[PDB]
Subunit: 327 residues, 4 copies
Amino acid sequence: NIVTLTRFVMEEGRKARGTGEMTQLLNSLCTAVKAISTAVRKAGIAHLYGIAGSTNVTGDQVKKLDVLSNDLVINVLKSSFATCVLVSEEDKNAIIVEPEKRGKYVVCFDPLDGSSNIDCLVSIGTIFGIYRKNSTDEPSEKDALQPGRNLVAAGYALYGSATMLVLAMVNGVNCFMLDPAIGEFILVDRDVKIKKKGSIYSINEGYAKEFDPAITEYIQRKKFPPDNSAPYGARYVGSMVADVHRTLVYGGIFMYPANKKSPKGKLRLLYECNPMAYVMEKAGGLATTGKEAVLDIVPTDIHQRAPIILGSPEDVTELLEIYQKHA
Amino acid sequence: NIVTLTRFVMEEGRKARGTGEMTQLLNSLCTAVKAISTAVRKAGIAHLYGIAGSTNVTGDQVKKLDVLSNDLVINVLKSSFATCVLVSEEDKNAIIVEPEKRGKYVVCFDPLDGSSNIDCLVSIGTIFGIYRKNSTDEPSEKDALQPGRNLVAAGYALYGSATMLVLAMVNGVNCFMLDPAIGEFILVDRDVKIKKKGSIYSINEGYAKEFDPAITEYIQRKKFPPDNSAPYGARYVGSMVADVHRTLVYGGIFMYPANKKSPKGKLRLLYECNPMAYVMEKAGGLATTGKEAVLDIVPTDIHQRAPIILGSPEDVTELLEIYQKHA
Amino acid sequence: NIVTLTRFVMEEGRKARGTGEMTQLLNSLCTAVKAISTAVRKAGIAHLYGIAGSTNVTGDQVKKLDVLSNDLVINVLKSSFATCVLVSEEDKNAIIVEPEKRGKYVVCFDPLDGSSNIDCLVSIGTIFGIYRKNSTDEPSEKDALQPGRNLVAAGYALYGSATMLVLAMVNGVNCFMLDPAIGEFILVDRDVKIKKKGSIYSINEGYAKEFDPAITEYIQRKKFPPDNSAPYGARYVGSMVADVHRTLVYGGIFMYPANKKSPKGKLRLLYECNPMAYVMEKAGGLATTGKEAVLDIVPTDIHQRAPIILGSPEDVTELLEIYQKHA
Amino acid sequence: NIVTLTRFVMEEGRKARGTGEMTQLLNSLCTAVKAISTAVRKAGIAHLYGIAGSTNVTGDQVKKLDVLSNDLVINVLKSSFATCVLVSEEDKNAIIVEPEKRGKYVVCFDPLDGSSNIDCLVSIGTIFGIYRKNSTDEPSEKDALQPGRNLVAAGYALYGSATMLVLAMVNGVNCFMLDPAIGEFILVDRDVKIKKKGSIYSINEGYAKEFDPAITEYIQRKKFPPDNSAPYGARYVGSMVADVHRTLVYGGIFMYPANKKSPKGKLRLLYECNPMAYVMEKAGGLATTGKEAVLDIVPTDIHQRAPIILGSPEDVTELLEIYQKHA
Ligand SMILES: Nc1ncnc2c1ncn2[C@@H]1O[C@H](COP(=O)(O)O)[C@@H](O)[C@H]1O
Ligand SMILES: Nc1ncnc2c1ncn2[C@@H]1O[C@H](COP(=O)(O)O)[C@@H](O)[C@H]1O
Ligand SMILES: Nc1ncnc2c1ncn2[C@@H]1O[C@H](COP(=O)(O)O)[C@@H](O)[C@H]1O
Ligand SMILES: Nc1ncnc2c1ncn2[C@@H]1O[C@H](COP(=O)(O)O)[C@@H](O)[C@H]1O
Ligand SMILES: O=P(O)(O)OC[C@H]1O[C@](O)(CO)[C@@H](O)[C@@H]1O
Ligand SMILES: O=P(O)(O)OC[C@H]1O[C@](O)(CO)[C@@H](O)[C@@H]1O
Ligand SMILES: O=P(O)(O)OC[C@H]1O[C@](O)(CO)[C@@H](O)[C@@H]1O
Ligand SMILES: O=P(O)(O)OC[C@H]1O[C@](O)(CO)[C@@H](O)[C@@H]1O
Ligand SMILES: [Mg+2]
Ligand SMILES: [Mg+2]
Ligand SMILES: [Mg+2]
Ligand SMILES: [Mg+2]
């Protein structure tokens, strides 16, 4: 029996005896991702280069891919009538949905992650995290400031050689491959679990002169193994969604610790770190800042940053031990 | 006026006063690339998972993406009636085309480059190099053993966030974006030239323990600039086609030198090194093994490996200086 | 607010306080239609003509469009776990779903209507009707033998210049246009109502010598108006879904009465007549055999045929009056 | 070997020893057809309905399908650098191409034929006729006023259940099916020939009251065969391109004679009648006005109308006999 993402969310909704609001929300997300994907692959770009001349746009209507993605998510999610608060990396303040379309969910998301790889056509994606409004007060930013451990659903969509949507909820992580021919996400990996120990480390070594002693010692250990084993291979795409996804599928470790330019790390806690940390833990992986669990951080700024180390259990604990040793 | 790959090729053929054979060859290459791109993006995957019943071959009995790609290239190229000899990474010996479909061209290619990035959906692609048959004796593998300097055309197709074909010939490097909506490649950047110097280095530091003194010193400079300037950023996708394209567009340097386990490097000369070296020089860049120009090497085996250092002229020259610095 | 078919069925399910089974069923239908559509437009036909040579099919695997459509519906519907009895024009006996996937719904359908227009690429489509099992007995064909008036949902998908899915339920008829770019049906026509009187008649006049006096008199009246007005224009595609859809959108009348070859008419009652009759009546139209309401016929054969006249109110009643006059 | 429209055209160009100009023209025509096909199938319609926000132009402010199609043809054709004069159904006067893009060919076309079938999603298409500029004086409308007999190439693209392009030149009629999956037209039937006699007649019997005695008698024979053979079946889609294609493939006859409101017929000579007449004769069929060959008419206005009767030789000849029968 083939299983589409649409059949899956609906069924999981039924098993949970939900009123259907979250389902309608997940369905919206699915539609948003397909639209972003189609745009990312440059469908209709011939129109930009005047295949039909220059007459359509009566004015100056053009939009950067990232901006368009942001508009797709915002509109699509709002039209689901399931959300009350939206947090986008593209907006300085949280977006409070009008009462007429207000729902109980809070959605934090990165509409198009990996901006530095956009112009060079490297894999990019969309990241998201979903919370339930924990309050009775007027909806506001505070409703977005919950620790990751409270997430009800999280995941991402990877626009690589092929497009894949990975969804994590309380009962596990599932990966669905997008069949562009019929516009359908097909479940191809069910209760996904990450390998206990990998053979690949992922980090931008250009910041080498700014790394702490723990990170420095660990990287050295990956190149010159004390047990004289084969050193880990290195891989760093530059796009979090791509590096993180390979980590889930192949195992290993991904890191983005603090440095001069980023004493609190670079990546955003609400719509980058937490979602990926939740996916990792649901797959039996770990996600730490080096000192604490990412999902346990109670945020105070919707755009707050956080250091992050995630991936295979044994790999992450090995680094955690280096941190504990130096302490 | 909008320019499609098809119009471009046809015009370069009329200017060159070609008989139309090379044009048919490039036309076919273009068609193959599109077919590969569609399979890579997973159109029709739902059928593989029983969308229409007949769920039995669910395992490992249907063509793998790399095999399908190889089939497309070989079949499409033969059907152009423009080739006599074909060299594929997936085939131990050179393919000698039937006398009935025999043409004057020789093609070396990598049907799907970046095999390790396939399962994690990281960017992958196709690389090609075209030679004009010179000798008069029956076609053989010796016909594909010419130095890259004799290349008539070379390039690649990148299956990334979007698909792009990069073609380099005597008078330039042109990039064409594929519009999947109409199955048309659109010219989006004409006579491409790489920047004199970049701020990104690309190499698998995993073989640090195996690197020669020159590479080791160069990397040291990128992380700890002696003049105290800003350190280069690091990027290593793992697919040559993806790392090389970013190099062409953003500038910088890409490296795969020889390591213990790979005394003569890892990358293949005929269908990986030469094509990329040809694209780089035509763009004003450099491609060296650290001691000689890649394009000058006289191949002795169609699967011969060779070390390669390519990218921005100033960055490549700096490493060359280090190589000669170490005598 | 844009509305996808997926959001619509889900919401209509919520408003009805259904357990979600019918929704999962409607969602399945939606997926089936997209797959059939993609096939009808000939996606991947290049593989049939050996663009990748001849190596994939280890044997002789080819399928006629109609057969494939049938397999898509059967499998897709069964995988919804919402049906117990399926009736296809392609199967002599009703299909009783296994207990493991058994649901409460009975589905009658024409997987690919308009077979005579297939080879000439004329518009074709899929027709469907849905009933709820009215019994406690073991599921069987009888469960499919309910009069049209009992339908819970009916409609069709038209594969014409563009693909459109028209869905009718108790509270009205809605048309959704398929956006192939993102694989999404977009609601573009809400509580659709047919014009009270049209200006187009649709019938195969090749059977002229076999028509009854009523039909003959009516056709004459359409060409030579007694009130001396402009005669109706004639239109007959040859595909019921196409002729019927134009009738809904433009108004007018569609007819397929009995003749020598078909004393009980040609069209099938369960998966051709009833579904279209239900759509017509929900749009304020009429559907008669000339003597009685199509939806009131209690069938005794799943493959039973019925004469049918449908379309605008005034047009159909005018013919009904001719029938009553001759009586 | 699989043959694409692109390979076919390029080869016919090499055989004909053409300079490559007509080839570029056909290459462009092919690209235009694909772009039209994608718009007709409604890709990206979700954007028109606010999928990404900006819901204000929802009404009648964006280009209609017929206008967009016309823009594509004109722009794409000009950009081929192969034409000097263009005649479109949508333009009152002939388009004289700028001297900078001027070529030796003249093109008459119907951007989107079957306007009345657009809103009901019935099959529609594009028709074209290509002439070689002969005179030496400045290009003008007179250059498009040559009898169809001088046509160098003519044909059409049918946007039906699937999209197909039919091209007719001096040595034959070939049909190519469009594979939307890769944006490639595949040759599926080479030197096409219509059957000597069909069993289907196509005409709008709505103008029965206006038909001349010949047509009236012929139709009588099709419904009430004097020799008591089987009556012909009737089919009338309403889009010339759709009715003519079925005629080519299934055989039979298509008719649009002159009626009171249309003393000189309805269909246009330059871009409807001549192209279809050219395709029919090259396929062994006939195309008459009832008194003369369509292709022999010397046009006096680029929007001149003309009666037309085309199809299987025996069926057309029988009607011609009736015409001369009535003196
Ligand atoms: N589609 C679903 N998948 C998983 N859990 C769900 C789903 N729908 C509802 N739930 C769970 O049920 C709760 C209430 O759902 P709702 O009434 O739709 O807001 C959600 O917050 C989830 O914990
Ligand atoms: N489409 C083309 N683009 C660029 N150069 C071409 C093209 N066609 C032919 N040439 C040049 O002309 C030579 C002979 O072409 P041909 O007669 O097709 O084998 C080629 O080796 C190229 O150097
Ligand atoms: N998506 C829906 N749209 C319209 N009516 C629905 C829907 N879902 C359920 N219903 C109605 O509620 C009944 C029970 O639904 P269920 O419990 O899903 O079998 C159906 O037979 C319909 O009458
Ligand atoms: N691709 C082609 N297919 C068929 N005939 C062609 C083609 N190219 C050129 N011809 C013939 O050669 C003539 C001159 O071609 P050209 O030099 O391109 O204007 C045309 O008018 C055609 O009769
Ligand atoms: O260039 P740097 O410092 O490695 O930053 C790359 C990181 O920044 C981001 O682009 C920010 O979202 C991530 O996708 C990626 O992990
Ligand atoms: O794992 P490694 O040794 O870095 O290999 C990476 C290289 O291997 C390849 O996949 C070989 O084709 C290249 O695409 C890539 O540059
Ligand atoms: O050739 P005939 O007798 O008009 O039959 C055409 C009818 O048959 C069908 O193909 C049967 O489904 C209908 O779609 C169409 O209305
Ligand atoms: O409604 P009528 O008079 O039959 O017109 C039908 C004809 O009109 C057209 O739409 C005119 O382009 C043709 O495609 C078709 O043959
Ligand atoms: Mg980001
Ligand atoms: Mg390779
Ligand atoms: Mg039928
Ligand atoms: Mg027309």
